[PDB]
Amino acid sequence: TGELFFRSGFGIGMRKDSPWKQNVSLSILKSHENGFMEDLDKTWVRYQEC
Amino acid sequence: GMMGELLSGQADMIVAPLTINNERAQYIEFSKPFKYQGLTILVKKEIPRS
Amino acid sequence: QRAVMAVGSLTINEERSEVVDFSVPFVETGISVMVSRSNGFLEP
């Protein structure tokens, strides 16, 4: 029940000196824009309904 | 917990559901969120019979 | 270098990810389709 409030996303915990910031952000954005995220959502979170 | 383990140097990258917060970001930088979901209320529903 | 900050309805994209840098987004959005709504025995 209820409605969405204090909406916020997820994240990846990395140290501030890690040089993998852009190399991971670009890959995440590419996966998001190539439809991998929606496919994973369909194949892992929408098994059955009521 | 996990944040302290990451700060201690035991772990370098975290792939787990972690909500981005200001206090967490003040010490550990995050990346772009995978998906945008807030917090709701879960209550068990009853079945009216008679 | 005509402006150090840009504020507006700029959608985050892969092409702009490496050319410029952006902070954490505050309002989420995306691709959507707009279409006009169509109109529409004790069995159930």
Ligand SMILES: *[C@@H]1O[C@H](CO)[C@@H](O)[C@H](O)[C@H]1NC(C)=O
């Ligand atoms: C990140 O990507 C760039 C270009 O895609 C590459 O030159 C660089 O080596 C990458 N970083 C690492 C740590 O491999």
